[PDB]
């Protein structure tokens, strides 16, 4: 059912955001400061946009939620040089966030996801 599922997503998103200790993924990459970003990145994503989507009922299953979180990480690895704070943060977030999503998926299974 939608109510318990959205509560699960909010908690999951909060935990993912807590893993981003440097607040690197909190808001969209500022395109005005990074004008070549869209030359490399097909679909930007960030935690604020995810929260907006969540509250606007755009995540009605777990896969769509996962897909957007995974974009946050994959975009960052793809765009940034390996020796940057950003790339290193994405490597860490993939591992830590991955554990969060594993646990959250198991919870979603216990509810009503297909």
């Amino acid at each position: 059912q939608l109510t318990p599922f959205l509560i699960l997503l909010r908690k999951t998103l909060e935990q993912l955001q807590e893993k981003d200790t440097g607040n690197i993924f909190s808001e969209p990459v500022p395109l005005s400061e990074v004008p070549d970003y869209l030359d490399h990145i097909k679909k930007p994503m960030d935690f604020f946009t995810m929260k907006q989507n969540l509250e606007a009922y755009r995540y009605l299953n777990f896969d769509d939620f996962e897909e957007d979180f995974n974009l946050i990480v994959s975009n960052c690895l793809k765009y940034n040089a390996k020796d940057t704070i950003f790339y290193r943060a994405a490597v860490r977030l993939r591992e830590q966030g991955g554990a969060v999503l594993r646990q959250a998926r198991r919870q979603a299974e216990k509810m009503g996801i297909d």
């Binding site: 990459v29 990074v34 970003y37 490399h40 765009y79 940057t84 950003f86």
Partner: peptide, 8 residues
Amino acid sequence: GGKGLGKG
């Protein structure tokens, strides 16, 4: 594929 200039 090469990467971007960077975020600074």
